């Protein structure tokens, strides 16, 4: 998440591909 | 850490120096 940022849908973008974006905050929000 | 970012380790750099980086969300979820 802190090296991109969210810009309009899925759906609009050709030719895009998808994946699990990784969020730091969770692995701290588990000790919490 | 919003600073600064993480990159390689502190092996490399020449001179590198220790300090305390302070990191906000720590103080945040302790509280």
Known sequence: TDNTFVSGNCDVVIGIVNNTVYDPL?????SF
Do not use: R
């Not at 969770?26 to 588990?30: A, G, I, S, V, Y």
């Open 26 to 30: 969770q692995p701290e929000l588990d």
